[PDB]
Design an enzyme around this catalytic site. Structure first.
Site, mmCIF file in Angstrom:
data_model
loop_
_atom_site.group_PDB
_atom_site.id
_atom_site.type_symbol
_atom_site.label_atom_id
_atom_site.label_comp_id
_atom_site.label_asym_id
_atom_site.label_seq_id
_atom_site.Cartn_x
_atom_site.Cartn_y
_atom_site.Cartn_z
ATOM 1 N N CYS A 228 3.361 1.633 9.214
ATOM 2 C CA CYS A 228 3.297 0.987 8.767
ATOM 3 C C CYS A 228 5.197 0.067 7.954
ATOM 4 O O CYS A 228 5.615 1.046 7.714
ATOM 5 C CB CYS A 228 2.332 1.174 7.429
ATOM 6 S SG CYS A 228 1.383 1.064 7.874
ATOM 7 N N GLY B 295 3.064 6.880 9.393
ATOM 8 C CA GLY B 295 4.262 6.413 9.300
ATOM 9 C C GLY B 295 4.075 5.568 9.817
ATOM 10 O O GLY B 295 5.868 4.830 9.482
ATOM 11 N N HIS C 212 0.952 -0.657 0.415
ATOM 12 C CA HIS C 212 -0.274 0.083 0.177
ATOM 13 C C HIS C 212 1.105 1.241 0.403
ATOM 14 O O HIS C 212 -0.255 2.210 -0.057
ATOM 15 C CB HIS C 212 -1.258 -0.604 1.296
ATOM 16 C CG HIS C 212 -0.221 0.677 2.365
ATOM 17 N ND1 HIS C 212 -0.853 -0.475 3.403
ATOM 18 C CD2 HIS C 212 0.488 1.772 2.932
ATOM 19 C CE1 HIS C 212 -0.209 0.071 5.042
ATOM 20 N NE2 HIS C 212 0.970 0.796 4.269
HETATM 21 O O1 LIG Z 1 -3.229 6.124 1.146
HETATM 22 C C1 LIG Z 1 -1.776 5.896 1.441
HETATM 23 C C2 LIG Z 1 -1.207 5.737 3.213
HETATM 24 C C3 LIG Z 1 -3.167 5.340 3.897
HETATM 25 N N1 LIG Z 1 -2.939 3.735 4.236
HETATM 26 C C4 LIG Z 1 -3.631 3.983 4.979
HETATM 27 C C5 LIG Z 1 -3.936 2.562 4.487
HETATM 28 C C6 LIG Z 1 -5.659 1.837 4.040
HETATM 29 C C7 LIG Z 1 -5.989 0.278 4.137
HETATM 30 S S1 LIG Z 1 -4.454 -0.500 4.379
HETATM 31 C C8 LIG Z 1 -3.258 0.966 4.561
HETATM 32 C C9 LIG Z 1 -2.974 3.491 2.739
HETATM 33 C C10 LIG Z 1 -2.196 4.370 1.929
#
Ligand SMILES: OC1CCN(Cc2ccsc2)CC1
Ligand SMILES: OC1CCN(Cc2ccsc2)CC1
EC number: 3.4.19.12
Lengths: 304, 304
Positions: free
Chosen positions: A145, A143, A41
């Site tokens: 992730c 941040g 993502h």
């Molecule tokens: O737009 C970007 C930043 C925010 N993330 C949030 C998210 C939603 C489902 S998985 C990760 C997605 C990619």
């Protein structure tokens, strides 16, 4: 003596954390050998995450769009592929700090340490359990992730978790390092509800044994029970069923304390039925379920 | 979202841990530049620890009696001195992994991470608070002495604690890195009783603010109180007095949540008077006091 919620020393994982930037999104990646692992993502804009088609979004991406920084030094991306919900960025440099490692997919009720990271930099370490509903109750801000969960066996890091998202209820979902989500979750900005958050019974019992070893014994009673009888009570209190596999695993704690597993079950039964009457066990007012039997033995024996 | 008992990443401290052996005693030391710091009780036999005269015991010791091993490589001891309750072993090699560091003596109620170590090898990391009675509630087995407590400010490790002993009650006592014990304790095998283990009020309030930020709000009430009124209640429940210095420090949490510090005091007052009626706050059934206001801001803002 004493018993603490204890994380693995995080140094070996600290040396693996990098920053990955795609367009305006920055999150964390894991640099092992000449591959950087990150959530797919990373490639998504806000509008993409409604119904993202990752194969279609990746067609628009080249190696040079993935900006990978290890400390303040850029890594050269020489290839990229998607495996399930992770991207693997091939870089031209093997991570010189790569520890001996494995990728493991854990079972619900297993514990691991999370190194919470932002911009590829570690902020802290805590101990988690994979909940029976395949969520984890973490501490993750935007941040974070690509932050990873791991176990260490002497010099070998077993990576079990990569952080991908927060559910609308503020609990956390992610993948193993093959990119397969724990539970039914998807990397999409959609209503996703967690199932019943049940208590990990075998872990509670391990922690009761830890309590006895440490001199907290007030809850030990005169009773015993059977696996079937205990399980009737367990289901009523949204506790996971206890199996003979769980009884077998508790055997070393039973042996050290001389308290039969089924007797400890009868103590736990009365605690469920009676509550703690304002008392504490190892400084908790509730029954702790984020220590495995292996965790209790390890902490109580001093394994490095 | 989410709020966890979070330790500092331990890598910078892992690179400082060595094994110190004197005669048949092995414990941990801290290797910073060309000095290894360890508890002076490394030199003591069982009989010594009744009434040890450290100056007299050290007269019988030479540099070559202090065996210092960093991983599987021996360090050459070229000097040794006693500073209060620590030994400083001058070695011929500067630790190449020496981080930027300071030695700090913390105040009661301050939090820090412990890297529990055995034979100079890290076993785990957890978050502690210096209790108002200058004990810590750790997880330390035999061999863990010389394990250290620290804070990290970006790249600078502030060392605040070295582990020296367990009291007969299973709580822990140690020194700053100048070798001065926290509290009235001495490095002697004698009856030493801890004073009242009071609750760190300002930390409880910080954690209530953390709870609100994370959506746990059931305990917020319609009331306010005064510092004097709150303090009457605090003393009755063995809570530390709250000062205007504590109110000042809670100011950023007050600002972010829009809940006046004295209103949060009135919420805490009712929780003390009424208990939690079987409810939880951030997954605790008791009021958590091992997060400082600085800890709450840091975790809630994502500082690396
Ligand atoms: O737009 C970007 C930043 C925010 N993330 C949030 C998210 C939603 C489902 S998985 C990760 C997605 C990619
Ligand atoms: O005999 C050695 C090993 C055990 N320790 C225990 C202790 C008692 C007070 S401080 C440290 C002393 C030295």
């Amino acid at each position: 003596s004493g018993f603490r919620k204890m994380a693995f020393p995080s140094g070996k994982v600290e040396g693996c954390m990098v920053q990955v930037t795609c367009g305006t999104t920055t999150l964390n990646g894991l640099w092992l050998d000449d591959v950087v692992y990150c959530p797919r993502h990373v490639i998504c804009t806000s509008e993409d995450m409604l119904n993202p088609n990752y194969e279609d979004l990746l067609i628009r991406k080249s190696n040079h769009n993935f900006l990978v920084q290890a400390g303040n030094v850029q890594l050269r991306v020489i290839g990229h592929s998607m495996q399930n919900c992770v991207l693997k960025l091939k870089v031209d440099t093997a991570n010189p700090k790569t520890p001996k490692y494995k990728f493991v997919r854990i079972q619900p009720g297993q514990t691991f340490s999370v190194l919470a990271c932002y911009n590829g930099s570690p902020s802290g370490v805590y101990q988690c359990a994979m909940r029976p509903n395949f969520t984890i109750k973490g501490s993750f801000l935007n941040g974070s992730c690509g932050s990873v969960g791991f176990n260490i066996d002497y010099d070998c890091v077993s990576f079990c978790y990569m952080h991908h998202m927060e559910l609308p209820t503020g609990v956390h979902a992610g993948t193993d390092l093959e990119g397969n989500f724990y539970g039914p979750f998807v990397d999409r900005q959609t209503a996703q509800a967690a199932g019943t958050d049940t208590t990990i019974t075998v872990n509670v019992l391990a922690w009761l044994y830890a309590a006895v070893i440490n001199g907290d014994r007030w809850f030990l009673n005169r009773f015993t029970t059977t696996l079937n009888d205990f399980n009737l009570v367990a289901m009523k209190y949204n506790y996971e069923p206890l199996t003979q596999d769980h009884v077998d695993i508790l055997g070393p704690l039973s042996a050290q304390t001389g308290i039969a597993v089924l007797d400890m079950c009868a103590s736990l039964k009365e605690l469920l039925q009676n509550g703690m009457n304002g008392r504490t066990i190892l400084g908790s007012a509730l029954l702790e379920d984020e220590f495995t039997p292996f965790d209790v033995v390890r902490q109580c024996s001093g394994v490095t």
